[PDB]
Amino acid sequence: SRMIFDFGFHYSKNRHVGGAVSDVPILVVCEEAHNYLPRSGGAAYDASRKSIERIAKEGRKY
Amino acid sequence: MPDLGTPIGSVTDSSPSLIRIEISSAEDFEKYKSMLGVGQYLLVASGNNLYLLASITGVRATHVNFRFQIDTQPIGTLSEDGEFSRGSHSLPVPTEYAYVTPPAVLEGIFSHQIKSPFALGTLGISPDIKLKIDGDRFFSKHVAVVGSTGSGKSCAVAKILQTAVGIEKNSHIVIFDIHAEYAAAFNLEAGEAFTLNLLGVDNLRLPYWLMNAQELEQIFIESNEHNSHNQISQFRHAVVRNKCKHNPTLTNLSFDTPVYFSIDEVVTYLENMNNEVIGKLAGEGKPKLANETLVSDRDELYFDAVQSFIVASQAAATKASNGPFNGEFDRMILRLHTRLADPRLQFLFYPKKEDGEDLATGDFADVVRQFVGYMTKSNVSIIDLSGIPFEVLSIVVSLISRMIFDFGFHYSKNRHVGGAVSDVPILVVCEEAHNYLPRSGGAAYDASRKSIERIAKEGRKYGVTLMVVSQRPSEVSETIFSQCSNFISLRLTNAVDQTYVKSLLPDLSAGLGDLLPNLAQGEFLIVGDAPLMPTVGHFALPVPEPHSRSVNYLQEWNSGWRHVDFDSVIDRWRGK
Amino acid sequence: LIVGDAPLMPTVGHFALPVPEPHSDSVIDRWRGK
Numbered sequence: 089s090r091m092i093f094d095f096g097f098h099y100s101k102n103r104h105v106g107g108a109v110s111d112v113p114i115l116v117v118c119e120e121a122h123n124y125l126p127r128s129g130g131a132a133y134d135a136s137r138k139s140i141e142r143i144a145k146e147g148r149k150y
Numbered sequence: 151m152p153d154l155g156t157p158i159g160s161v162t163d164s165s166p167s168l169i170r171i172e173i174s175s176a177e178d179f180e181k182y183k184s185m186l187g188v189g190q191y192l193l194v195a196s197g198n199n200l201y202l203l204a205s206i207t208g209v210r211a212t213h214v215n216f217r218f219q220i221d222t223q224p225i226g227t228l229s230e231d232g233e234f235s236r237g238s239h240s241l242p243v244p245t246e247y248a249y250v251t252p253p254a255v256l257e258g259i260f261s262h263q264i265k266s267p268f269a270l271g272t273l274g275i276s277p278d279i280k281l282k283i284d285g286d287r288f289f290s291k292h293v294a295v296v297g298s299t300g301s302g303k304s305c306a307v308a309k310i311l312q313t314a315v316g317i318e319k320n321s322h323i324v325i326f327d328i329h330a331e332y333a334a335a336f337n338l339e340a341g342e343a344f345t346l347n348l349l350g351v352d353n354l355r356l357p358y359w360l361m362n363a364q365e366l367e368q369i370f371i372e373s374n375e376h377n378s379h380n381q382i383s384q385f386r387h388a389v390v391r392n393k394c395k396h397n398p399t400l401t402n403l404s405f406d407t408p409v410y411f412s413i414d415e416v417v418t419y420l421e422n423m424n425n426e427v428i429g430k431l432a433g434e435g436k437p438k439l440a441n442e443t444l445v446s447d448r449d450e451l452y453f454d455a456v457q458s459f460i461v462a463s464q465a466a467a468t469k470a471s472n473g474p475f476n477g478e479f480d481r482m483i484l485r486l487h488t489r490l491a492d493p494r495l496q497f498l499f500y501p502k503k504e505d506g507e508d509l510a511t512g513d514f515a516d517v518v519r520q521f522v523g524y525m526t527k528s529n530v531s532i533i534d535l536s537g538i539p540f541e542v543l544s545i546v547v548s549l550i551s552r553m554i555f556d557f558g559f560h561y562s563k564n565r566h567v568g569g570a571v572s573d574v575p576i577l578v579v580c581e582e583a584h585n586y587l588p589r590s591g592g593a594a595y596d597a598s599r600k601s602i603e604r605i606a607k608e609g610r611k612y613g614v615t616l617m618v619v620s621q622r623p624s625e626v627s628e629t630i631f632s633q634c635s636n637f638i639s640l641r642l643t644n645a646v647d648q649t650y651v652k653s654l655l656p657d658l659s660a661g662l663g664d665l666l667p668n669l670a671q672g673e674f675l676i677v678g679d680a681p682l683m684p685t686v687g688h689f690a691l692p693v694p695e696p697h698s699r700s701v702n703y704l705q706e707w708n709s710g711w712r713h714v715d716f717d718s719v720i721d722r723w724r725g726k
Numbered sequence: 727l728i729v730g731d732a733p734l735m736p737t738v739g740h741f742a743l744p745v746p747e748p749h750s751d752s753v754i755d756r757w758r759g760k
């Protein structure tokens with residue numbers, strides 16, 4: 089996921105410099121989320137619940 | 151005072167809390183169907199040469215001939231002279247008539263008894279009429295808004311602000327954004343002569359030494375582990391001892407007092423302290439380096455550059471023991487090297503003046519100019535926060551707020567010495583508050599609440615007021631509302647939200663809640679002290695409108711398979 | 727509204743305002759911020 093987001097970022101920068109909004113959208117479909125995004129869980133599952141979260145708050149733009 | 155007209159019907163039940171009117175003619179009801187609707191007002195008799203105003207709360211129609219029913223509640227009293235008192239002092243007897251409230255009477259009551267006017271739209275019954283409130287009561291006190299999605303909150307707020315800035319007295323306003331929306335609502339022709347300072351992630355200047363204790367402790371440290379004790383102590387010691395060396399003149403400094411203080415130097419100090427090794431030989435109760443040279447005052451050398459010491463040993467000739475704080479501080483060093491390694495956050499750690507040089511202790515003044523601007527003219531500023539990450543948002547907000555409260559108090563004192571009240575008002579606008587002011591939230595956002603709580607309590611005396619906006623008021627701070635003296639309610643549907651907003655708000659029986667979920671697009675309800683009495687109102691679209699350009703998806707899918715030159719993107723993607 | 731043992735009976739009253747009342751460019755020359 090981190091790769092996707094960083095790519096969208098570095099691309100939005102360029103097309104914004106050009107003055108045009110992005111043109112390459114992406115939709116990430118996630119299934120059986122509760123197996124890899126727990127609500128009450130250990131730090132062992134702290135590498136995912138962070139990355140994906142970055143998409144929720146700062147996605148629409150990029 | 152004037153000829154009210156022909157009545158509607160008599161009374162059939164009376165009390166201080168409730169009143170019940172009864173109509174028995176359909177031709178009479180259909181004629182005045184538009185006024186008798188909810189929210190609007192009616193006149194009742196309470197003896198000769200008086201009248202009583204009531205607010206419609208509840209209608210019912212039945213067919214068994216027809217029978218209507220209008221439930222009402224009393225607000226206040228009005229004479230034939232024109233005076234409008236408040237507070238009920240009469241129960242109306244039956245066989246007393248009722249009449250419908252014309253506009254003319256409302257306009258007459260509005261004009262005279264209102265000290266200073268501020269327009270806030272037009273009533274629904276008649277568009278060619280302008281609703282007014284007290285000029286000073288409104289913008290010198292704490293407003294609030296709550297609206298369901300699509301209810302047109304942003305446009306209404308933009309209209310309010312435009313009027314406050316004379317767009318169709320010099321006033322200062324800051325508007326925090328999360329969607330990049332309110333920027334265009336102020337993009338009139340340059341010749342208008344009202345300053346506009348647009349800010350973002352590229353041009354914002356905001357050093358990190360302005361922080362209070364909580365923010366500094368929060369960015370670079372996490373106190374979850376067992377090593378949470380010692381880190382904080384020695385961190386404080388280091389930051390202080392480094393604060394003076396670069397600012398000698400001043401006196402009696404403390405952790406909180408703001409002045410320049412580098413951070414890389416603090417990292418160097420912490421590291422050099424990780425690896426210390428002490429000597430226990432005779433008259434050598436102090437450290438020992440690689441070149442057999444003792445040390446007297448730590449602060450003199452530890453900062454400059456890393457140093458290496460001899461190895462621990464137990465020989466009677468070479469007696470070297472390990473240091474007190476060796477080993478513990480290993481992680482936070484890498485964590486800090488990382489955070490500083492971040493490019494996207496460069497505006498906070500490694501900022502630059504216009505010329506190119508780094509900041510200095512004195513530029514503090516200019517740091518506030520951005521928020522303040524020109525003095526004798528309106529200077530609405532529009533901060534942007536989309537580009538900012540999700541972890542530093544609370545910090546940014548707290549700092550930008552405290553920096554304003556301090557200025558307010560300072561100018562309030564500077565004018566108290568003279569004896570005249572300050573003529574510089576400042577408004578803060580907080581949008582989508584439910585993200586960074588959670589009521590169910592814990593310490594993850596502890597730094598934000600307080601920076602606003604102050605304005606909730608003190609701000610009024612000093613000269614700065616708030617304006618909160620949200621769309622899910624249940625998951626918002628209980629304290630930030632209660633200090634709000636006026637409420638604007640647009641459309642709300644979700645039930646629990648109705649319950650909460652009904653509770654918090656006092657003069658709301660069942661009907662005033664039955665009115666929220668059926669309001670139209672552009673309408674609103676007003677409840678508080680700025681009006682004489684509750685009211686239902688209608689707005690117009692603002693000019694120019696906010697757009698917040700966004701990426702259209704389906705209209706883009708129908709296009710071609712555009713060659714993403716991954717090569718060029720990744721190439722520019724240095725990240726080195 | 728008063729409640730408890732002191733009054734002869736629960737009751738509501740109103741308070742008269744107490745006179746006296748309780749109240750409490752180069753401008754920013756405080757870089758110290760204190």
Ligand SMILES: Nc1ncnc2c1ncn2[C@@H]1O[C@H](COP(=O)(O)OP(=O)(O)OP(O)(O)=S)[C@@H](O)[C@H]1O
Binds near residue numbers: 299
């Ligand atoms: N008096 C009015 N007459 C006609 N249309 C109106 C009126 N007031 C508002 N609108 C319409 O409301 C529409 C959208 O409102 P928005 O400004 O998108 O609401 P909002 O503030 O974005 O709420 P969100 O989506 O939760 S951020 C606009 O396209 C307007 O045309």
Ligand SMILES: [Mg+2]
Binds near residue numbers: 303305331
């Ligand atoms: Mg909006």
